[PDB]
Write a protein that binds this ligand. Sequence first.
Ligand code: CLA
Ligand code: CLA
Ligand code: CLA
Ligand code: CLA
Ligand code: CLA
Ligand code: SF4
Lengths: 31, 154, 97, 42, 93, 80, 143, 75, 66
Amino acid sequence: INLPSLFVPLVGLLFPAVAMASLFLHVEKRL
Amino acid sequence: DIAGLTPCKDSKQFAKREKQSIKKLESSLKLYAPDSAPALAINATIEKTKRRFDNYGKQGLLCGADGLPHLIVSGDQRHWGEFITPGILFLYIAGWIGWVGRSYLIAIRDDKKPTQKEIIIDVPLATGLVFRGFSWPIAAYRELLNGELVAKDV
Amino acid sequence: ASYKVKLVTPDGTQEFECPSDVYILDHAEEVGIDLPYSCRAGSCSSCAGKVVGGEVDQSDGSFLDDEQIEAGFVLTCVAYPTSDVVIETHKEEDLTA
Amino acid sequence: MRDLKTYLSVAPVASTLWFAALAGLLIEINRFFPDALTFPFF
Amino acid sequence: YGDKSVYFDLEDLGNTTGQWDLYGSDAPSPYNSLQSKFFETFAAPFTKRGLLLKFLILGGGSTLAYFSATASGDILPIKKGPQLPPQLGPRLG
Amino acid sequence: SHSVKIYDTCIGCTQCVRACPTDVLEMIPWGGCKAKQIASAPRTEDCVGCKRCESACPTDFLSVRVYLWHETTRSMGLAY
Amino acid sequence: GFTPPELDPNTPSPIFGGSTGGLLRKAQVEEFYVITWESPKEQIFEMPTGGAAIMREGPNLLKLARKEQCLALGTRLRSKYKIKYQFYRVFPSGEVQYLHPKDGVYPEKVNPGRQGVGVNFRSIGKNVSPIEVKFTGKQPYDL
Amino acid sequence: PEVKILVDRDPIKTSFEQWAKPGHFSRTIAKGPDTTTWIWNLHADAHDFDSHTSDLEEISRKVFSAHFGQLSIIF
Amino acid sequence: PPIGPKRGAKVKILRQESYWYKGTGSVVAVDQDPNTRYPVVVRFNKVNYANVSTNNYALDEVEEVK
Ligand code: CLA
Ligand code: CLA
Ligand code: CLA
Ligand code: CLA
Ligand code: CLA
Ligand code: SF4
């Protein structure tokens, strides 16, 4: 219920994971 | 006075500094033989320190809140001894040096192997040339007027 | 001063007049016995020759082996003929090996 | 002798002798007129 | 290729370029068939690239979200909060 | 692939050709000088961009110029 | 017009003990080079990748992973020894491609069968300003 | 095979000729300097005896006497 | 009738990509040949950055000076 308790892990842990996985996937293979 | 400073001879902090300085040296003189080499050397520098403070007082220097003799370079004629007459002396000496060097460079520029006379100085030519620096100001003025100081063609 | 210079050459062997202060190749052009050249600055094998007698000043030399100076080879473009030396022309490749 | 005179005028030796003379001159000058922050004669 | 001294042949470039596999077994499944039939039946739904990736990301995300939004005070001092009165600054406070 | 150009100030000394590590340059007939020779660059797809050829050019300014450009694995000198 | 020599496999290669400077995956998937020379006698020569090898009396064929390494070995063979060499480029296809000396004579020797590639008939000081080739795909030097 | 003292008499005559000449050992240096880079090279290769020549005998003679000079400095 | 400045002359350089640009040099030889784009050969008293003191020039790049 404490809003930081949710948004600081998601933005600090989940979001970089998703974004970096996606950006690696996009940058590192041929179209 | 100028910039709120006060004549060191009449300042109190300037004196306090002098007495404090002189005080510590006197302590160094103690714990040794009264007329020993080290003690004699300490005495000498004590007298030297007293002479320096009196010389500063006599020359009419300006002292601030720390008692340190500040130097005025605005051009006030009460203070030309601080910057402007030493400045004229410096400009004279530096023009001497530069003019002698330039004279030498020009004189050796006409040989086939001019670099030989640069890594190995022709000292006879140099000693013939050194004393033209004495009149370097007149020579340089007349060279500028002649138009031969600055190379044309460049 | 102006010592006579002898040059063996496929055209033959001729004699020309040139002052010790000048390169053999430069005055050769003034007379007119044609020799090879390219850079004219002492850094290539084009104007190479070797000597039969005497020796030329090695002061005007560069881009040469620490031996080409004393094993015989020389560059006509960058060389002062200190004596009545006899030199070879068209000598690049037996220098090029 | 001639060659010794030459070598004694090579750049490093010429400059060390010049600067040693200059250092001696300045040292003596400040040994006679010490602690000088200005030109007090005129 | 490998005829005493030669090691180069256009017909077999892979042997020439050392395209070997120095440690592969080329042996049959050491696992008993019964055991194989138990695993590949239960671990099957996790072998689709996009499916596995999406499920992994979102499941782990909500895992972390739940486990941190509902952590107790004895796990993280950041949620236990302060337990003492605060001091004053050099002049403020 | 780097781009190597030869300019007409070339004296055809051929020192640069004898300098290149990858056999990019060549000597070809010409008529604009006393050697009847000039440098060509028919194989710049192998040029590593080392520019040894420029340090061997005795002309002023240079007659052989290497403009580094898009990189290949040949251009980057990579053995892996 | 100088039919290039065709690569002859079964040609022996120098006596080497092996090295960690040899071929790699790039030779497996993209390309590698092969150099050949003929060796008046059996001698010791420094390998362009590692230590020293022994060239055999008779045909020598060495496979290197870099063209630059091949040319280095060729220069060393050609002037320290007096040996004539040729090298080729091999693709994972099984294609070979004669590389050097391209037209039978070394490139330092002018040959009357070569065309000019990348020659500009002007001095290097007469290239246009970049502003002149702005917004067109050309480079001021490529002109 | 056997070991003995083996010497050479007066290989180089002491003289002030080469002091007057800066970089006598290097042929290029000996001639003289065109730029400021020549002065730096003169110092950078002063004690690289194995490049002033190729004779091992000369290199080792130079090394021996340089060691003597160093010992004198230490003393 | 020969071409370009005479041998031994004093010519100013006008090729702005040259090291001695706007400087002066001494002519050494101008080939009478046509078909050469840079006949003049000029020697200078100062090396360039490549330690080279002679260079070829075209007739328009040199300009005889006093
Ligand atoms: C650029 C402005 C900005 C900045 C620098 C921050 C910074 C911060 N916020 Mg925050 N936030 C903002 C705007 C901003 N916020 C806005 C406009 C809102 C809606 C009113 C919120 C609502 C919010 C909440 C509810 C919380 C934070 C929290 C936090 C702190 C923890 C980090 C975090 O979880 O990220 C922020 C978490 C969010 C949910 C922010 C989402 C809203 C913004 C607009 C997202 C923008 C993303 C965008 C696509 C990328 C922009 C490009 C650029 C920033 C790189 C952190 C110091 C947490 C906290 O309090 O820490 C103790 C917390 O729980 N913020
Ligand atoms: C930037 C956001 C962020 C967040 C929210 C966290 C959060 C956390 N870190 Mg941490 N860390 C971060 C960044 C972050 N870290 C960075 C950038 C670094 C590099 C320096 C580190 C280096 C680091 C170290 C070295 C350690 C931590 C540890 C911890 C945990 C200590 C608290 C605890 O004990 O609770 C509870 C303790 C737990 C073990 C709960 C486990 C966490 C959940 C249950 C895992 C499940 C996640 C889910 C399955 C999917 C994974 C992620 C997915 C969303 C992609 C905590 C949950 C400590 C730790 O606990 O080790 C893991 C610890 O050793 N972190
Ligand atoms: C940055 C601003 C500024 C500047 C540029 C100056 C400049 C000057 N001030 Mg001033 N001042 C300033 C700010 C400034 N002041 C401010 C803000 C204050 C208030 C605190 C003052 C208060 C002040 C006072 C009270 C006085 C000055 C004075 C002077 C002059 C003293 C020097 C002189 O007399 O000429 C030059 C002196 C010479 C002896 C000339 C010799 C120099 C030679 C010719 C040059 C040497 C060159 C070389 C050796 C030989 C030539 C070689 C060549 C031919 C190639 C000078 C022109 C004094 C004055 O009035 O002047 C009389 C003075 O009384 N100022
Ligand atoms: C003990 C005190 C001291 C010391 C150690 C130095 C030391 C130095 N000063 Mg300096 N200076 C001082 C006091 C001092 N100065 C004072 C009191 C003044 C006020 C007049 C100056 C004003 C001054 C100037 C204007 C310059 C120096 C410069 C220099 C440096 C080079 C000097 C030189 O090149 O020699 C020999 C001289 C030459 C090789 C070339 C000739 C240049 C000099 C200045 C003669 C100029 C003659 C010309 C007619 C006058 C021009 C007027 C000027 C306003 C442009 C040097 C490290 C120079 C510098 O900083 O270099 C960037 C510089 O130009 N000083
Ligand atoms: C003939 C000697 C001589 C002369 C007349 C000048 C004159 C000048 N120099 Mg220069 N300079 C010199 C030597 C000289 N320099 C040497 C040896 C160096 C190498 C360190 C430099 C490096 C130098 C720089 C980096 C700069 C100048 C600059 C300048 C100009 C401004 C004044 C200045 O700031 O100087 C500064 C003076 C120094 C930095 C050191 C001076 C070195 C000594 C004092 C002079 C040497 C005298 C010579 C050895 C004596 C031989 C005499 C003979 C009888 C043996 C001025 C025209 C400046 C300029 O460009 O103006 C716009 C500038 O930026 N000089
Ligand atoms: S950059 Fe290197 S490989 Fe390319 S032409 Fe110049 S020297 Fe040859």
